[PDB]
Ligand binder design. Structure first.
Ligand SMILES: *[C@@H]1O[C@H](CO)[C@@H](O[C@@H]2O[C@H](CO)[C@@H](O[C@@H]3O[C@H](CO[C@H]4O[C@H](CO[C@H]5O[C@H](CO)[C@@H](O)[C@H](O)[C@@H]5O)[C@@H](O)[C@H](O[C@H]5O[C@H](CO)[C@@H](O)[C@H](O)[C@@H]5O)[C@@H]4O)[C@@H](O)[C@H](O[C@H]4O[C@H](CO)[C@@H](O)[C@H](O)[C@@H]4O)[C@@H]3O)[C@H](O)[C@H]2NC(C)=O)[C@H](O)[C@H]1NC(C)=O
Ligand SMILES: *[C@@H]1O[C@H](CO)[C@@H](O[C@@H]2O[C@H](CO)[C@@H](O[C@@H]3O[C@H](CO[C@H]4O[C@H](CO)[C@@H](O)[C@H](O[C@H]5O[C@H](CO)[C@@H](O)[C@H](O)[C@@H]5O)[C@@H]4O)[C@@H](O)[C@H](O[C@H]4O[C@H](CO)[C@@H](O)[C@H](O)[C@@H]4O)[C@@H]3O)[C@H](O)[C@H]2NC(C)=O)[C@H](O)[C@H]1NC(C)=O
Ligand SMILES: *[C@@H]1O[C@H](CO)[C@@H](O[C@@H]2O[C@H](CO)[C@@H](O[C@@H]3O[C@H](CO)[C@@H](O)[C@H](O[C@H]4O[C@H](CO)[C@@H](O)[C@H](O)[C@@H]4O)[C@@H]3O)[C@H](O)[C@H]2NC(C)=O)[C@H](O)[C@H]1NC(C)=O
Ligand SMILES: *[C@@H]1O[C@H](CO)[C@@H](O[C@@H]2O[C@H](CO)[C@@H](O[C@@H]3O[C@H](CO)[C@@H](O)[C@H](O)[C@@H]3O)[C@H](O)[C@H]2NC(C)=O)[C@H](O)[C@H]1NC(C)=O
Ligand SMILES: *[C@@H]1O[C@H](CO)[C@@H](O[C@@H]2O[C@H](CO)[C@@H](O)[C@H](O)[C@H]2NC(C)=O)[C@H](O)[C@H]1NC(C)=O
Ligand SMILES: *[C@@H]1O[C@H](CO)[C@@H](O[C@@H]2O[C@H](CO)[C@@H](O)[C@H](O)[C@H]2NC(C)=O)[C@H](O)[C@H]1NC(C)=O
Ligand SMILES: *[C@@H]1O[C@H](CO)[C@@H](O[C@@H]2O[C@H](CO)[C@@H](O)[C@H](O)[C@H]2NC(C)=O)[C@H](O)[C@H]1NC(C)=O
Ligand SMILES: *[C@@H]1O[C@H](CO)[C@@H](O)[C@H](O)[C@H]1NC(C)=O
Ligand SMILES: [Ca+2]
Ligand SMILES: [Ca+2]
Ligand SMILES: [Ca+2]
Ligand SMILES: [Ca+2]
Ligand SMILES: [Ca+2]
Ligand SMILES: [Ca+2]
Ligand SMILES: [Mg+2]
Lengths: 424, 452
């Protein structure tokens, strides 16, 4: 065997030589490190054999009423003690909560082609509030608008086009990057009133500055008013999107820093930081548990369908030319997003690897990266994941920890890893 | 691996000038050898012009280098000749403030090309703010100075060439022909334009703003489905068509639903010869391009950078890292699939933001390449990777990693955001490498030396 062929000079070496290796303390010296059955073939007390284990610390039961006190993932914390090469497996239980609150921020393109949309969205407040009663008892809505970076070449910069980026007859307000019009509120009537006060704008190039705005909504936190609940971001537009690299045209080369720059509810730094990259958005949307609904016109479905494939917990729906259909669009996208859970883990150390197996309704079982997924999850449905973690020849000298969580949820599982590289 | 990384020469410009944004070798003869450094946010003495930008001439020699601005254009804006009457009084016909002159700097022989891609003008008709871009060309040891703004044409506004930003990228061919990229033409379809120096000089008249160069080569306007592609975001030159006339390599990073592609154009009639496609939406494939023989068979090979390329780590985490693609030319053509790829390892590092041929650094018969990752490194100051050529193309591992020896500041250095290699400054037989770090207004010159 390999315990012997390892020539374990010490106990530590013997343990790191394989999870089936024991070490006697009572014929070469390295023969003290043999298979556990071989060493017996040595008093069982004189055999040193530290095995791994899973020890649960926090294990609040899935619930069946503040958002803080509702549990959908279980357990919430545990310790894995890892013999090198020996995997430790624990089970994650996920139950979709019954009456979970929803925050929906409506982020809207206000370039001129969206003028007609704006006239239908100004009643969305109360209409969406009404429709949301078949989904949740606790709904809040907010509104933000975007156009473009306010620099050449994306906007015309004649004094006159700065005042009015559109034609003289059209009475467009000055171009702007992002305005938080209304932080989240349960008052649908306030949504209606403020949205009805907003003026349509304009700019020059077809793709728009919405990524600048998405970033702000994701990272600005208390300014937007996000709770620890379902966070829906509806991104509504009839055009493509600028992204990192496009800034260079306007002499903007500093990458987006992913931090809030809202003053008086206006994004003030669009002239200074580049548009975000897709990757940067993936990071900050996921970190901030934002589920994104791309509500866009048929012309741009192809673009946004590709974008959706890159942005975790996103959905695309086909917006009508004046947003007449956006409520159903939202409901249908929400149903898509909610019926699937996707697990992501934080970074592991070198030599540490993780494996997922999923066990979903109707006996559909996933492995590989499909092991992180369960689909077709109805309200009150329970699904489970078997997660396996394995360390190799002892990384670090202390313990590590990482989080596993379903994307779009505040809830998470803290996994603390302790590596067995010695004896006692 | 034989770049003197312990003792590089550091060039410094005005703080906040973005000195190092563009860099170049200048050699009329080896006697007057020098480094050129663009500083597109530099203040100049041009009347009425705020941050017009400058290009610095940095003499190379035994003594410590000191850089001085080159005077391509000492005047402010020309005037709308119809305005000097009227009633509103004088009105400028062009806008040189914030024009980023020096954003691109290139040299061939005793000729220097410097571009201001954010230069804009009014037109002489209805008032616009058309950022057509402009370039200045000094020829024959600074004796003659020409302006070349081929997008400053009779076709105005974004529908035409008004937003062209000609000179956004630029290169010289081996014959000294000027090649410009302008990514804004025809609702950001983008455009390549090219003229010989003789053609530019033959029709240069600062009296007229629209100086139609006859015989000019330029890509043609396409249908609206090609809008917002940014052809000419980057350009390089190399021979890919079997003759003795260098061809034009051009990035089209937002083409094909933002998957991007790179095109190679016939240097004789600017007709399309090859396209190479990106592999991921918005990876900015074609952010940078380069052409050089990296495997010693005498055929130019294509390199393309996609600095926003996102991959997944072994434990399932997406990360922005960037990637460079290499396509080897063969006698029958060039295959559309990359021969090899190099992927960055620093998250958000923007590996592949810049590329440069190094020539043969170690003199082993294979030309080598440098690739920048401007936000790479442990303190995100930026990094430059040297990769060796070889019979099957580039090595998979860097043979040298260059990093700024100075400490990080509160703002990014952008070390490696600009590169220029493959020329021998001191003439010791070994090629040398210029690296920009415009975030701290510096440029670094690495000397190649004998090493084993
Ligand atoms: C090249 O030269 C230019 C020109 O000198 C130089 O640009 C200046 O750079 C300094 C340093 O960063 C800037 O100083 C800051 O000014 C902030 C407020 O400035 C306001 O007031 C300016 C003066 O107004 C009077 O004078 C002008 C000119 O005669 C006149 O037109 C006015 O009517 C008025 O009489 C004004 O020029 C300036 O306008 C610019 O900026 C605003 C942005 O709001 C923009 O709207 C304008 O279009 C124009 O671009 C502005 O209105 C001041 O708050 C700030 O102080 C804060 O920041 C510093 C950090 O920098 C902190 O330390 C401090 O505690 C504060 O928090 C700072 O002092 C100056 O404004 C620039 N001027 C211009 C015109 O851009 C470049 O730096 C030079 N570049 C190089 C490479 O050398
Ligand atoms: C690499 O990838 C790029 C991008 O995909 C490829 O470039 C594209 O190639 C296609 C196919 O060649 C181009 O479409 C064609 O354009 C030609 C040329 O049009 C120009 O020249 C004509 C005279 O020669 C002129 O009449 C045209 O003027 C019209 O069109 C313009 C623009 O719409 C308009 O402004 C004018 O008012 C006129 O309306 C124009 O100046 C055109 O002739 C083609 O039409 C024929 O073929 C099509 C397809 O079969 C057919 O439907 C038509 O009926 C007609 O028979 C066609 O439109 C496209 O413009 C290129 N795009 C860009 C951005 O360059 C490239 O080919 C790839 N290279 C390789 C090696 O694969
Ligand atoms: C998402 O999950 C839902 C909930 O499970 C699921 O809906 C269910 O689909 C199954 C089919 O996959 C339905 O099962 C049928 O039920 C009827 C009685 O209502 C039976 O008569 C059927 O029996 C036939 O089919 C069997 C197939 O094994 C045969 O063995 C048998 O001999 C019969 O031929 C069958 O069992 C079930 O009724 C629904 N439930 C509801 C509430 O609608 C939905 O399909 C899933 N969607 C996916 C996976 O996309
Ligand atoms: C032009 O643009 C189209 C998009 O309209 C590009 O098509 C897309 O290509 C990518 C990469 O090849 C495809 O994604 C890949 O999917 C496979 C299979 O799932 C997977 O193994 C890869 O890792 C990658 O995710 C994508 O599906 C595809 N989209 C569509 C709508 O076809 C195309 O590649 C671009 N280039 C050319 C020359 O057409
Ligand atoms: C919503 O969830 C966030 C994240 O879990 C909470 O913020 C955390 O608060 C704890 C308090 O002990 C800190 O240790 C964490 O560092 C915080 N995390 C972040 C990212 O800030 C927040 O308190 C929750 N809000 C409510 C109302 O329960
Ligand atoms: C997916 O995995 C589950 C669990 O391993 C399988 O369901 C079990 O099937 C056995 C069959 O004898 C039953 O005795 C168990 O009671 C089932 N589990 C539960 C929790 O009820 C299922 O068969 C697997 N499906 C596939 C296709 O492999
Ligand atoms: C690049 O363009 C040149 C034209 O500038 C092509 O050369 C022409 O090819 C035709 C084909 O029969 C000849 O009739 C012309 O006399 C050629 N003209 C010149 C100036 O050589 C050349 O073939 C193109 N290269 C490729 C690879 O397509
Ligand atoms: C919005 O326009 C659509 C056509 O795109 C039309 O069918 C619908 O009636 C309009 N909405 C309202 C509220 O009038
Ligand atoms: Ca726009
Ligand atoms: Ca509309
Ligand atoms: Ca050729
Ligand atoms: Ca070659
Ligand atoms: Ca070499
Ligand atoms: Ca040298
Ligand atoms: Mg628009």
């Amino acid at each position: 065997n390999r315990c012997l062929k390892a020539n374990a000079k010490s106990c530590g070496e013997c343990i790191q030589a394989g999870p089936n290796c024991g070490w006697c303390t009572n014929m070469p010296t390295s023969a003290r490190c043999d298979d556990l059955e071989a060493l017996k073939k040595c008093p069982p007390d004189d055999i040193e054999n530290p095995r791994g284990s899973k020890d649960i610390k926090k294990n609040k039961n899935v619930t069946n009423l503040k958002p803080e006190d509702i549990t959908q993932i279980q357990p919430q914390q545990l310790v894995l003690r890892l013999r090198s090469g020996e995997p430790q497996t624990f089970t994650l239980k996920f139950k979709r909560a019954e009456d979970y609150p929803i925050d929906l921020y409506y982020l809207m393109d206000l370039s001129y082609s969206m003028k007609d949309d704006l006239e239908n969205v100004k009643s969305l407040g109360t209409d969406l509030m009404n429709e949301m009663r078949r989904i949740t008892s606790d709904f809040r809505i907010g509104f933000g608008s975007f156009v473009e970076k306010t620099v050449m070449p994306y906007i015309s910069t004649t004094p006159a086009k700065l005042r009015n980026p559109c034609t003289s007859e059209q009475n467009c307000t000055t171009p702007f990057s992002y305005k938080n019009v209304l932080s989240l509120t349960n008052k649908g009537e306030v949504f209606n009133e403020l949205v009805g006060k907003q003026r349509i704008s304009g700019n020059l190039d077809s793709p728009e500055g919405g990524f600048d705005a998405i970033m702000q909504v994701a990272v600005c936190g208390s300014l937007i008013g996000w709770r620890n609940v379902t966070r829906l971001l509806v991104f509504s537009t009839d055009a493509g999107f600028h992204f990192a690299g496009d800034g260079k045209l306007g002499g903007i080369v500093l990458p987006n820093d992913g931090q809030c720059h809202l003053e008086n509810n206006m994004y003030t730094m669009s002239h200074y930081y580049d548009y975000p990259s897709i990757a940067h958005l993936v990071q900050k949307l996921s970190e901030n548990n934002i589920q994104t609904i791309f509500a866009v016109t048929e012309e741009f479905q192809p673009v946004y369908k590709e974008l959706k494939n890159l942005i975790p917990k996103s959905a695309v729906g086909t917006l009508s030319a004046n947003s007449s259909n956006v409520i159903q669009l939202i409901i249908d996208a929400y149903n898509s997003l909610s019926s699937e859970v996707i697990l992501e883990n934080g970074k592991l150390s070198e030599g540490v690897t993780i494996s997922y197996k999923s066990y979903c309704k109707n006996g559909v079982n996933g492995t590989g990266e499909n092991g992180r997924k369960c689909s077709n999850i109805s309200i009150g449905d329970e699904v489970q994941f078997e997660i396996s973690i394995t360390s190799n020849k002892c990384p670090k000298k202390d313990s590590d920890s990482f989080k596993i969580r379903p994307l779009g949820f505040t809830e998470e599982v803290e996994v603390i890893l302790q590596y067995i590289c010695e004896c006692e | 691996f034989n770049l003197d990384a312990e003792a590089p020469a550091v060039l410094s410009g005005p703080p906040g000038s973005f000195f190092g944004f563009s860099v170049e070798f200048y050699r009329p003869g080896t006697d007057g050898v020098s480094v050129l450094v663009g500083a597109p946010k530099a203040n100049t003495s041009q009347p009425g012009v705020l941050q017009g930008g400058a290009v610095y001439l940095c003499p190379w020699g035994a003594s410590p280098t000191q850089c001085t601005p080159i005077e391509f254009d000492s005047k402010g804006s020309r005037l709308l000749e119809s305005s000097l009457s009227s009633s509103e009084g004088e009105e400028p016909v062009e806008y040189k403030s914030l024009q980023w002159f020096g954003a691109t700097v290139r040299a061939h022989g005793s000729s220097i090309l410097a571009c201001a891609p954010l230069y804009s003008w009014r037109t002489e008709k209805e008032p616009l703010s058309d950022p057509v871009g402009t370039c200045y060309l000094s020829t024959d040891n600074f004796t003659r100075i020409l302006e070349y703004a081929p997008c400053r044409s009779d076709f105005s506004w974004a529908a035409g060439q008004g937003y062209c930003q000609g000179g956004f990228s630029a290169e010289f061919t081996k014959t000294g022909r000027v090649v410009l990229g302008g990514p804004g033409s025809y609702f950001w379809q983008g455009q390549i334009l090219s003229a010989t120096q003789e053609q530019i000089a033959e029709s240069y008249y600062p009296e007229y703003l629209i100086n139609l160069v006859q015989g000019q080569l330029q890509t043609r306007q396409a249908s609206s489905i090609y809008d917002d592609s940014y052809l000419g975001y980057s350009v390089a030159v190399g021979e890919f068509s079997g003759d003795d006339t260098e061809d034009f390599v051009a990035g089209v990073p937002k083409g094909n639903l933002t998957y991007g592609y790179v095109t190679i154009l016939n240097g004789s009639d600017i007709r399309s010869l090859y396209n190479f496609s990106g592999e991921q939406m918005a990876s900015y494939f074609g952010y940078a391009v380069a052409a050089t023989d990296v495997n010693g068979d005498g055929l130019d090979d294509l390199l393309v950078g996609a600095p926003l390329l996102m991959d997944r780590t072994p434990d399932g985490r997406p990360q922005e890292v960037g990637r460079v693609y290499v396509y080897l030319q063969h006698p029958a053509g060039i295959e559309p699939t990359p021969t090899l790829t190099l992927t960055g390892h620093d998250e958000f590092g923007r590996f592949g933001s810049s590329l440069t041929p190094l020539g043969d650094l170690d003199q082993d018969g294979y030309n080598d390449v440098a690739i920048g990752a401007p936000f790479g490194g442990e303190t995100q100051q930026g990094v430059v990777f040297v990769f060796p050529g070889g019979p099957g193309g580039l090595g998979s591992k860097p043979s040298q990693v260059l990093q700024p020896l100075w400490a990080a500041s509160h703002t990014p250095d952008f070390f490696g955001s600009a590169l220029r290699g493959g020329r021998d400054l001191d003439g010791n037989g070994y090629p040398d490498l210029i690296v920009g770090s415009f975030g701290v207004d510096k440029a670094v010159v690495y000397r190649g030396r004998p090493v084993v």
